[PDB]
Write a protein that binds this DNA or RNA. Structure first.
Ligand SMILES: [Mn+2]
Ligand SMILES: [Mn+2]
Ligand SMILES: [Mn+2]
Ligand code: NA
Ligand code: NA
Ligand code: NA
Length: 324
DNA sequence: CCGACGGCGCATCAGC
DNA sequence: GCTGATGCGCA
DNA sequence: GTCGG
């Protein structure tokens, strides 16, 4: 049902980027997700309508698309200059719905206008512009494996007790990835631990030293967002620049962290809701119970991802089964 | 009908 | 100059 | 936009 999920996804993007209606955005993605998981070719809106997250308005849109092969609402939007331009500009990392809208109001609507007005861009936005095409390329699993070996090894060089784990799409096992996500732990940093200084900085700084990390979007004591690039050969094609995220998490919370940052995004949304549907509340850090009123108690002990799955009564699903 | 739908780390900057 | 307000991206 | 109060 690629035709239908593509349509719902494009509608989602509009609601997020133009209408700034984040809950409609989520509603469309939730519908696109449940439809992609449907093992039958959808013959009608009423057929989709049986699925949870698909409602009256989306069934009708499905009837139209199935009849005409297109959607008039999407046509008009694509034709609309302000809508189209705002949508476009949000493809730049660091330009969200609000910046995109402001730019367009000022007559800035293309990559070229962004070039002409670099003085109006902040540092993250200049980086996103610089790497516009690069950031929209997928990363082949082969290069993700080369990236993994560099990160793991340079982490070793700073200190051998660090544990770095590549999570996200890679850990689900996908053949290409949108970026690289790295969870970092160290024995000195736990949920108590007196706050250990420069733990993440040391690793970011080394990765810069070996010229693997080329740009910084944001950097703090627990979270790094930036740009990296595989080393080239002699005269060879430069690899594309890639997005990399590094999160430093307390060691005692590594499994909740690995669970969350493996994803998928929709999966974790799905886990938290079913968590409450069993008396638990999950975040990135801990799994806790609520009682009868519903404040959450203390973090239950966890030594594996499945430990978390047990608590809320799901059959365990290997990383590869979480792409939602 | 109506309201909930997750929240946080980091960067920027308008308004003092 | 500072900081409350807000934007951004994110599994 | 959807669905469980
Ligand atoms: Mn069936
Ligand atoms: Mn990723
Ligand atoms: Mn990421
Ligand atoms: Na439904
Ligand atoms: Na953007
Ligand atoms: Na992505």
């Amino acid at each position: 049902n690629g035709g239908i999920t593509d349509m719902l996804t494009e509608l989602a993007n509009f609601e997020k980027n133009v209408s700034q209606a984040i809950h409609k955005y989520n509603a469309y993605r939730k519908a696109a997700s449940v439809i992609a998981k449907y093992p039958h070719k959808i013959k009608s809106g009423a057929e989709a309508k049986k699925l949870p997250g698909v409602g009256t308005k989306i069934a009708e849109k499905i009837d139209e698309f199935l009849a005409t092969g297109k959607l008039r609402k999407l046509e008009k939007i694509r034709q609309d200059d302000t809508s189209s331009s705002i949508n476009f500009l949000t493809r730049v990392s660091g330009i969200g719905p609000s910046a995109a809208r402001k730019f367009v109001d000022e007559g800035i609507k293309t990559l070229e206008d962004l070039r002409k007005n670099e003085d109006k861009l902040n540092h993250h936005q200049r980086i996103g512009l610089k790497y516009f095409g690069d950031f929209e390329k997928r990363i082949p699993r082969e290069e993700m494996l080369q990236m993994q070996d560099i990160v793991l090894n340079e982490v070793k060089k700073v200190d051998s007790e660090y544990i770095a784990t590549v999570c996200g799409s890679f850990r689900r096992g996908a053949e290409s990835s949108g970026d690289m996500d790295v969870l970092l732990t160290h024995p000195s940093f736990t949920s108590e631990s007196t706050k250990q200084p420069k733990l993440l900085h040391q690793v970011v700084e080394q990765l810069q030293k070996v010229h693997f990390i080329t740009d910084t979007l944001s950097k703090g004591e627990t979270k790094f967002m930036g740009v990296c690039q595989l080393p080239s050969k002699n005269d060879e094609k430069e690899y594309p620049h890639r997005r990399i995220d590094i999160r430093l998490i307390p060691k005692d919370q590594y499994y909740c962290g690995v669970l969350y940052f493996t994803g998928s995004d929709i999966f974790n949304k799905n886990m938290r809701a079913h968590a409450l549907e069993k008396g638990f509340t999950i975040n990135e850090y801990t799994i806790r119970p609520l009682g009868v009123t519903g404040v959450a108690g203390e973090p239950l002990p966890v030594d594996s991802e499945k430990d978390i799955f047990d608590y809320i009564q799901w059959k365990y699903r290997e990383p590869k089964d979480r792409s939602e």
